[PDB]
Motif scaffolding. Structure first.
Motif, PDB file in Angstrom:
ATOM      1  N   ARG E  42      15.424  -8.610 -47.518  1.00  0.00           N
ATOM      2  CA  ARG E  42      14.317  -9.565 -48.021  1.00  0.00           C
ATOM      3  C   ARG E  42      13.565 -10.304 -46.713  1.00  0.00           C
ATOM      4  N   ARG E  43      12.578 -10.189 -46.602  1.00  0.00           N
ATOM      5  CA  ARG E  43      11.865 -10.655 -45.115  1.00  0.00           C
ATOM      6  C   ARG E  43      11.003 -11.701 -45.387  1.00  0.00           C
ATOM      7  N   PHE E  44      10.902 -12.289 -44.508  1.00  0.00           N
ATOM      8  CA  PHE E  44      10.115 -13.866 -44.605  1.00  0.00           C
ATOM      9  C   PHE E  44       9.412 -13.681 -43.234  1.00  0.00           C
ATOM     10  N   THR E  45       7.891 -13.953 -43.235  1.00  0.00           N
ATOM     11  CA  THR E  45       7.114 -13.847 -42.045  1.00  0.00           C
ATOM     12  C   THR E  45       6.323 -14.950 -42.218  1.00  0.00           C
ATOM     13  N   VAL E  46       6.121 -15.921 -41.147  1.00  0.00           N
ATOM     14  CA  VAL E  46       5.636 -17.284 -41.413  1.00  0.00           C
ATOM     15  C   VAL E  46       4.934 -17.311 -39.965  1.00  0.00           C
ATOM     16  N   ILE E  47       3.739 -18.347 -40.067  1.00  0.00           N
ATOM     17  CA  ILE E  47       3.121 -18.818 -39.016  1.00  0.00           C
ATOM     18  C   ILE E  47       3.970 -19.844 -38.280  1.00  0.00           C
ATOM     19  N   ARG E  48       4.395 -19.698 -36.985  1.00  0.00           N
ATOM     20  CA  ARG E  48       5.161 -20.592 -36.327  1.00  0.00           C
ATOM     21  C   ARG E  48       4.378 -22.175 -36.467  1.00  0.00           C
ATOM     22  N   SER E  56       0.401 -16.113 -34.237  1.00  0.00           N
ATOM     23  CA  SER E  56       1.615 -16.299 -33.833  1.00  0.00           C
ATOM     24  C   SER E  56       2.574 -16.747 -35.014  1.00  0.00           C
ATOM     25  N   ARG E  57       3.628 -15.747 -35.372  1.00  0.00           N
ATOM     26  CA  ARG E  57       4.627 -15.749 -36.507  1.00  0.00           C
ATOM     27  C   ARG E  57       5.997 -15.684 -35.928  1.00  0.00           C
ATOM     28  N   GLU E  58       6.884 -16.015 -36.829  1.00  0.00           N
ATOM     29  CA  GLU E  58       8.315 -15.919 -36.578  1.00  0.00           C
ATOM     30  C   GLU E  58       8.718 -15.076 -37.811  1.00  0.00           C
ATOM     31  N   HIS E  59       9.856 -14.008 -37.639  1.00  0.00           N
ATOM     32  CA  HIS E  59      10.328 -13.125 -38.826  1.00  0.00           C
ATOM     33  C   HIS E  59      11.694 -13.731 -39.008  1.00  0.00           C
ATOM     34  N   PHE E  60      11.907 -13.914 -40.296  1.00  0.00           N
ATOM     35  CA  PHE E  60      13.246 -14.124 -40.683  1.00  0.00           C
ATOM     36  C   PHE E  60      13.702 -13.137 -41.827  1.00  0.00           C
ATOM     37  N   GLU E  61      14.698 -12.808 -41.812  1.00  0.00           N
ATOM     38  CA  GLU E  61      15.571 -12.053 -42.870  1.00  0.00           C
ATOM     39  C   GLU E  61      16.659 -12.525 -43.524  1.00  0.00           C
ATOM     40  N   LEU E  62      16.703 -12.119 -44.861  1.00  0.00           N
ATOM     41  CA  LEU E  62      18.072 -12.296 -45.753  1.00  0.00           C
ATOM     42  C   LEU E  62      18.611 -11.163 -46.070  1.00  0.00           C
TER      43      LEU E  62
END
Ligand SMILES: [Mg+2]
Ligand SMILES: [Mg+2]
Ligand SMILES: [Mg+2]
Ligand SMILES: [Mg+2]
Ligand SMILES: [Mg+2]
Ligand SMILES: [Mg+2]
Ligand SMILES: [Mg+2]
Ligand SMILES: [Mg+2]
Ligand SMILES: [Mg+2]
Ligand SMILES: [Mg+2]
Ligand SMILES: [Mg+2]
Ligand SMILES: [Mg+2]
Ligand SMILES: [Mg+2]
Ligand SMILES: [Mg+2]
Ligand SMILES: [Mg+2]
Ligand SMILES: [Mg+2]
Ligand SMILES: [Mg+2]
Ligand SMILES: [Mg+2]
Ligand SMILES: [Mg+2]
Ligand SMILES: [Mg+2]
Ligand SMILES: [Mg+2]
Ligand SMILES: [Mg+2]
Ligand SMILES: [Mg+2]
Ligand SMILES: [Mg+2]
Ligand SMILES: [Mg+2]
Ligand SMILES: [Mg+2]
Ligand SMILES: [Mg+2]
Ligand SMILES: [Mg+2]
Ligand SMILES: [Mg+2]
Ligand SMILES: [Mg+2]
Ligand SMILES: [Mg+2]
Ligand SMILES: [Mg+2]
Ligand SMILES: [Mg+2]
Ligand SMILES: [Mg+2]
Ligand SMILES: [Mg+2]
Ligand SMILES: [Mg+2]
Ligand SMILES: [Mg+2]
Ligand SMILES: [Mg+2]
Ligand SMILES: [Mg+2]
Ligand SMILES: [Mg+2]
Ligand SMILES: [Mg+2]
Ligand SMILES: [Mg+2]
Ligand SMILES: [Mg+2]
Ligand SMILES: [Mg+2]
Ligand SMILES: [Mg+2]
Ligand SMILES: [Mg+2]
Ligand SMILES: [Mg+2]
Ligand SMILES: [Mg+2]
Ligand SMILES: [Mg+2]
Ligand SMILES: [Zn+2]
Lengths: 127, 97, 83, 60, 97, 23, 206
Positions: E42-48, E56-62
């Motif tokens: 389950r992916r999460f991509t947001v603007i830093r 400019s983004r940072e990726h998170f996963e769960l």
RNA sequence: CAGGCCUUGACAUGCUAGGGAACCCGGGUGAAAGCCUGGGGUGCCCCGCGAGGGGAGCCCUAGCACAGGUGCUGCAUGGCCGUCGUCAGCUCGUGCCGUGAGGUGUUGGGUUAAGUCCCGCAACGAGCGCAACCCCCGCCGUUAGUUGCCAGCGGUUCGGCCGGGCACUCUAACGGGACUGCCCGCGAAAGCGGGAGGAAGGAGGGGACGACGUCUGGUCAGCAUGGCCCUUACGGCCUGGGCGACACACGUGCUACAAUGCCCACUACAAAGCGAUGCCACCCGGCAACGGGGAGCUAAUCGCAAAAAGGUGGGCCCAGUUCGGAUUGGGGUCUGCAACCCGACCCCAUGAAGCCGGAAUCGCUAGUAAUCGCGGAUCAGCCAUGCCGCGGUGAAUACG
């Protein structure tokens, strides 16, 4: 009796089974020339045994999964080159110099944020 | 054509025409002024007149400041002229063998 | 346009004042904010004021403006050109 | 106008459509994830502190 | 005689699939080994940045890891020491038949 | 081409179906 | 501004999550909200005990809140008078069986969250910010750390012109993943505005 | 923005009293909000066979403290981010040199992607950066065998379907593997060139990771916060409008100008994801969007699902066309209380500009560019041609 290699390329995995015979080749429940009908790249999938003369000497049982036709094709090339080496260890030389034994690591490069693709960059007006 | 932005500030159409007439000093050099863009702004000490202009021989970027908005405009054109005259003549220097 | 299975939409609070005027010998001028309401035939002949966000615009309903909305006849943006 | 807006989003609405999500942490109306109930700014703030179970920086 | 285990961390998940395989294995009789089901990401991509800076983004996963175990030869002797199952907090167990 | 709704390729571009791209 | 969160950069490699539990799509946001409500109250109340971390576990309609702290007694009280008091104001929020444990901190000057708070307190007390920062670093290194760096930014001393002030000793390799680096932040709230205090503590590699 | 409204107020902690607790269904007026209302039963601990008395778990009426402000200041700030720049730099301690700013080290010769390493040196060490430790991919192994797979055997209603098995593929956790380690040669050394072995070779490809600092960079409108300003209003509720306007101008993109193409029919080959008022098989109605039935799936099981380019066959014949699909008329669908302003889609008709683009200018060094489709977040729906990802097909060129 029966000979096997594992062939992989991009996102295709091909399992090939070499049994001696007249030359017939079947890929996923179809004749070879029917699966790749109208593809120019197909014949390259049989090149390892043309390099060790086993062109008509084997029959081919071949499964195939994933990727696309040409990726599956190159997977075969490695697979049957894998099988001929277990069929005969001395088949390595005069097959390894033909590169047929190595696995092609070139795969899709991941898309990165800020770009349009892997490297294609968005257009801008520096002016 | 020429565009004028008054950032966080309101100006008149007269002021915009003064800017266009003042940037017209750059027409002296007889070179294409491509999509010139002026940005007038207000800082706590005075006004800032920014500009970005492309020409066939390069780009011009300059910033002018002063308490008086028109003076900041004029200082901008002075800094833009010195850059344009450098773009138009610097190549002539390395001409003799 | 609205599904035919659903009805011809009127805000019901506008439809009511139409029929009470019909059933008594109309008309009084109707003020309303029901731009979304259709101009059903019972309205034909009345003059209704439509709110455009600022003014209630007197809109005389005729026979040829029925399958329409009240907003279409009290436009919201003042524009007279440039220059 | 924010505190009243934070309260009006909680209040069940006169129509089902008028319901929208806000950030349960800062009240932000935009970029609210439904999985966390958080905005993109709080999502990154809590994740960096380790207070989102399982959530880790993803690289591949 | 099925048990499936879901967890966000795979270190605790695998340990909690061993202490079930090990459990009813010696407790009689058959245990079909822990089979790793494919992981749901389950992916999460947001603007830093809190404001603009869109590129400019940072990726998170769960990652929701999955495991399956078949206690093949049940024998309700096993269905007892499994009632007192010391499994960590990060994992969730389902029991079906 | 892709911008033409009344063709197959156009319905593929929009992700829709109909007489010119059935399902 | 360009530095990644040194803890978030190490989740699963040198640091473990402060909330450990599985939850499914329809449940995650509700538990998580309760977790932050738990921390919202607890961080206000247990401030004076030296609250350095709050671990949280969940199994089945119950929760095991662990509390790491430097003054355990300030939490417990008289025989457990405040500790029992808490579990009631706690379970009133949780609505379930909110078991609460307490664990002391080995050295409250090898815990970056506390070092940052101590500096932030010294600042609100109007101490020499530059001196106080050198003190914190000197305390953490005397406590045996392999490296330490403290940062304070804002209207230091009241000056109109904001400024950043930092000091460092030993090794602080923020790019090293296997380096165990503890990070804590504290907000000195002064009459002239807010200052930020960042403490870095280097407890060795792994 | 216009209009209609509310004054401890949509919301916090309070203190004091009236009612009663709390609450639930309605009535009127109004666009709604609001205003006016009409009904109806509070435990406890209480003297209670008795009027009657509380109090306080909670709301409603009046106060007075207070709330509230996306009002100003990013030039008072914290936080987080952008940028120079993944560029190889920036410094410190002690010693030495200089009246002093400061120098030395950090320069120098060689080498490297690198202040990388080697040698040298009034310098000797140290830190932050570089690299490595982490993730993905590529080879192999171990553990596993379902909901995944099918090498052989048996059936097989023609379906890995059943029996059977974990070989294989796979899935997913843990390992091994590459170190200039080996060879030839140059070299003082560090390294460089070539060779073998090997799935992989000299950072293997990509990721995460961004030094002291700079831009008085960005954000008081995500949040926090100093200070200033508003207090029947610069606060709060509503309805409607606006944020979608349009003489013009620039930035980013989509679709194209066609035959290496366009159209129709048939037929292949993925990956990553998502999915219980969700994803929807299959059947029926409709040219269709869609509608009515209805199975399966808390999902390696059921489903979104068809991938498209491609392959086969047939048409078009160089025309502003069977190129292109703008614009407009008409008829419908669906969401939603409601599609006038201002939704998406379908169907009939309409069928624009555009014949490869001035000055100028962008991207890309390999599974890259180009081209082809697929998925997700946001989300009732959608103005997504955007964004973040995923695989298919797959180049050209680098003297310098
Ligand atoms: Mg794979
Ligand atoms: Mg052929
Ligand atoms: Mg691609
Ligand atoms: Mg840009
Ligand atoms: Mg202008
Ligand atoms: Mg002059
Ligand atoms: Mg207001
Ligand atoms: Mg506020
Ligand atoms: Mg909404
Ligand atoms: Mg929202
Ligand atoms: Mg962009
Ligand atoms: Mg195209
Ligand atoms: Mg067409
Ligand atoms: Mg600033
Ligand atoms: Mg700032
Ligand atoms: Mg600004
Ligand atoms: Mg500024
Ligand atoms: Mg001198
Ligand atoms: Mg010096
Ligand atoms: Mg010195
Ligand atoms: Mg230097
Ligand atoms: Mg120097
Ligand atoms: Mg050198
Ligand atoms: Mg480098
Ligand atoms: Mg030296
Ligand atoms: Mg180094
Ligand atoms: Mg095995
Ligand atoms: Mg080399
Ligand atoms: Mg690094
Ligand atoms: Mg603010
Ligand atoms: Mg402020
Ligand atoms: Mg004062
Ligand atoms: Mg409103
Ligand atoms: Mg509107
Ligand atoms: Mg807009
Ligand atoms: Mg103009
Ligand atoms: Mg576009
Ligand atoms: Mg294009
Ligand atoms: Mg022509
Ligand atoms: Mg024409
Ligand atoms: Mg024409
Ligand atoms: Mg045509
Ligand atoms: Mg129409
Ligand atoms: Mg509309
Ligand atoms: Mg073209
Ligand atoms: Mg040119
Ligand atoms: Mg390059
Ligand atoms: Mg798509
Ligand atoms: Mg939607
Ligand atoms: Zn938020």
């Amino acid at each position: 009796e029966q000979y096997y290699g594992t062939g992989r390329r991009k996102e295709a995995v091909a399992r090939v089974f070499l049994r001696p015979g007249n030359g017939k080749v079947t890929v996923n429940g179809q004749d070879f020339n029917e699966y790749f009908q109208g593809l120019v790249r197909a014949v390259a999938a049989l090149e390892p045994l043309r390099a060790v003369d086993a062109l008509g000497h084997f029959d081919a049982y071949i499964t195939v999964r994933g990727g696309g036709k040409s990726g599956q094709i190159d997977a075969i090339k490695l697979g049957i080159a894998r099988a001929l080496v277990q069929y005969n260890p001395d088949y390595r030389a005069k097959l390894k110099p033909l590169g047929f034994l190595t696995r092609d690591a070139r795969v899709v490069e991941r898309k990165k944020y800020g770009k349009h693709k892997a490297r294609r960059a968005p257009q801008y007006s520096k002016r | 054509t020429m565009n004028i932005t008054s950032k966080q500030m309101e100006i008149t159409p007269a002021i915009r025409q003064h800017v266009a007439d003042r940037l017209a000093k750059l027409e002296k050099w007889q070179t294409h002024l491509i999509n010139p863009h002026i940005i007038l702004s207000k800082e706590p000490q005075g006004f800032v007149a920014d500009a970005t202009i492309n020409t066939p021989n390069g780009v011009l970027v300059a910033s002018g400041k002063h308490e008086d908005m028109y003076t900041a405009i004029n200082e901008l054109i002075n800094k833009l002229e010195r850059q344009l005259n450098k773009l138009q003549h610097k190549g002539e220097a390395r001409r003799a063998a | 346009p609205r599904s035919l299975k659903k009805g011809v939409f009127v805000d019901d609070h506008l439809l009511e004042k139409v029929l009470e005027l019909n059933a008594k010998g109309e008309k009084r001028l109707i003020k309303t904010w029901s731009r979304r309401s259709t101009i059903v035939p019972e309205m034909v002949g009345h003059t209704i004021a439509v709110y455009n966000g600022k003014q209630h615009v007197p809109v005389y309903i005729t026979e040829n403006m029925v399958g329409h909305k009240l907003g279409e006849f009290a436009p919201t943006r003042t524009y007279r050109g440039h220059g | 106008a924010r505190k009243a807006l934070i309260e009006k989003a909680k209040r069940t609405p006169k129509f089902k459509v008028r319901a929208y999500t806000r950030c349960v942490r800062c009240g932000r109306a935009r970029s609210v994830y439904r999985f966390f109930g958080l905005c993109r700014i709080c999502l990154r703030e809590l994740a960096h502190k380790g207070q989102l179970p399982g959530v880790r920086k993803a690289s591949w | 005689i099925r048990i499936k285990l879901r967890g966000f961390d795979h270190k605790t998940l695998d340990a909690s699939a061993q202490k079930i395989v090990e459990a009813a294995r010696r407790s009689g009789a058959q245990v079909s080994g822990p089979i790793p089901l494919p992981t749901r990401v389950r992916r999460f991509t947001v603007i830093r940045g809190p404001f603009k800076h869109k590129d400019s983004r940072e990726h998170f996963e769960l990652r929701t890891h999955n495991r399956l175990v078949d206690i093949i030869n049940p024998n309700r002797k096993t269905i007892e020491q499994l009632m007192t199952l010391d499994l960590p907090t990060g994992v969730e167990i389902e029991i079906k038949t | 081409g892709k911008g033409d709704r009344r063709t197959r390729r156009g319905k593929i571009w929009r992700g829709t179906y109909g007489k010119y791209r059935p399902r | 501004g360009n530095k990644i969160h040194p803890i978030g950069f190490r989740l699963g490699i040198t640091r473990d999550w402060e909330s450990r539990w599985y939850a499914g799509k329809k449940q995650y946001r509700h538990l998580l909200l309760e977790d932050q409500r738990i921390r919202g109250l607890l961080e206000k109340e247990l401030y004076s005990a030296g609250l350095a971390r709050v671990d949280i576990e969940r199994a089945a309609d119950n929760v095991a809140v662990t509390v790491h702290v430097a003054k355990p007694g300030v939490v417990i009280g008289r025989g457990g008078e405040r500790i029992r008091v808490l579990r009631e104001e706690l379970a009133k929020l949780t609505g379930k069986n909110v078991a609460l444990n307490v664990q002391e901190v080995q050295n409250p000057n090898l815990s970056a969250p506390l070092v940052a708070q101590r500096v932030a307190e010294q600042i609100e007390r109007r101490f020499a910010v530059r001196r106080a920062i050198k003190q914190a670093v000197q305390r953490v290194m005397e406590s045996g750390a392999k490296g330490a760096k403290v940062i304070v930014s804002g209207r230091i001393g009241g000056a109109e012109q904001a400024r950043t002030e930092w000091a460092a000793q030993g090794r602080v390799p923020l790019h090293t993943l296997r380096a165990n680096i503890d990070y804590g932040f504290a907000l000195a709230r002064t009459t002239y505005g807010v200052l930020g205090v960042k403490a870095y503590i280097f407890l060795g590699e792994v």
